[PDB]
């Protein structure tokens, strides 16, 4: 029973640090936030229509 | 004029029954490993 607990801890403390290292999730929102802005190209295509 | 000592019966006999406490500590594990393949899969 000690045993199993230990190896509970240690899992627990992997669990909560891979969802830690998932929370990657902002790099890729961050950077979704700035290609929208730079699709925003849509400026130019209507510019170009006229 | 007489003293006595006395010897304590453990008992708490029903987690004894089994190794100890394997209610929430057995399973716990169990279930833990789970979490850490889930979590796993999402991080991927």
Partial sequence: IKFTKQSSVASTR??????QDAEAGMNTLGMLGHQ?????????????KV | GQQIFSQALLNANRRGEAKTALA?????????????????????
Avoid: P, W
């Avoid at chain 1, 929208?36 to 170009?48: A, H, P, R, W, Y």
């Avoid at chain 2, 929430?24 to 991927?44: D, G, I, N």
């Fill in chain 2, 24 to 44: 929430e500590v057995q399973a716990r594990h169990q279930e833990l490993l789970k979490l850490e393949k889930s979590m796993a899969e999402l991080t991927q």
């Fill in chain 1, 14 to 19: 992997n669990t909560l640090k891979m969802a």
């Fill in chain 1, 36 to 48: 929208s802005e730079q699709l925003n190209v849509e400026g130019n295509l209507d510019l170009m």
